[PDB]
Amino acid sequence: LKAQTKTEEFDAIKIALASPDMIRSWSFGEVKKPETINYRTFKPERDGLFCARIFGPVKDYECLCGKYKRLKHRGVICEKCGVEVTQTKVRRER
Amino acid sequence: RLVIYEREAPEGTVKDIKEQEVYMGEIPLMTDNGTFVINGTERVIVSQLH
């Protein structure tokens, strides 16, 4: 049978040195600015330590600017500010 | 009291403005029972030994 592709049970954790490319793997974007939040509307400043574009939407299944707020549109990256609409839990992951 | 000494001594002042009592902070008071009240609460400062 084919070995596997994606999530299944696991064993045997390995640890080793990181490579620039291996680092660029887990990274879904580069934070270019020290900014965090807008200071008025507490929404994340794009390309900052807190960012919806790079990391994740503030509220579940709702894009930042709000073009797609519906649970229907999920695997869609927004045109305005690219934020794919998915659980805010992925802001703990990415 | 703020004294401004005229430069080139003997020391004597051009003007010394003696300001009236200037309020710096308020300080806690001790009850007849030997307690202090910080916020609506009786508090005690334990004597230190060193």
């Binding site: 934070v31 270019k32 600015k33 020290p34 965090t36 507490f42 330590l49 | -």
Partner: protein, 150 residues
């Protein structure tokens, strides 16, 4: 994340990361501005210091957090934890379905049993109680069951 009184709260990693980012950018700019060597060197050194403070603080000058004397907790300290040596899976963890109270005698007991306070048993088995309740049909829906034991 927010807090009462409109105030905020945040990890020290943000202070650190912020420093590293800022200095890095400043270095890029100084490169484009063709700054003299002494400056680009000083900057590179500072960046090394910052990155260090981020990874593990205290092998270096021990940076302090914004408007606070206490040294900012670095990533190494995020891992190591504290209270001797444990990371969250040893020293302890908070656990659901549990309780406690003062203990009493109960000589009438049999060695295989113990007196459990009524309210306690109510609160502990609350999820099971819901289930049985609407299992027999004494409750319309789970909500109603909650209202029943409430």
């Amino acid at each position: 994340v927010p807090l009462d009184g409109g105030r905020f709260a945040t990890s020290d990693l943000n202070d650190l990361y912020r420093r590293v980012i800022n200095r890095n950018n400043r270095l890029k700019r100084l490169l484009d501005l063709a700054a003299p060597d002494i400056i680009v060197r000083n900057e590179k050194r500072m960046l090394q210091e910052a990155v260090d403070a981020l990874l593990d603080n205290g092998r270096r000058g021990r940076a302090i957090t914004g408007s606070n004397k206490r040294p900012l907790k670095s990533l190494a300290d995020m891992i190591k934890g504290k209270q001797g040596r444990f990371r969250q899976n040893l020293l302890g963890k908070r656990v659901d379905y549990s309780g406690r109270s003062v203990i009493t005698v109960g000589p009438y007991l049999r060695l295989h049993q113990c007196g459990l306070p009524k309210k306690m048993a109510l609160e502990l088995f609350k999820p099971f109680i819901y289930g049985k309740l609407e299992l027999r049909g004494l409750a319309t829906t789970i909500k109603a069951a909650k209202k029943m034991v409430e």
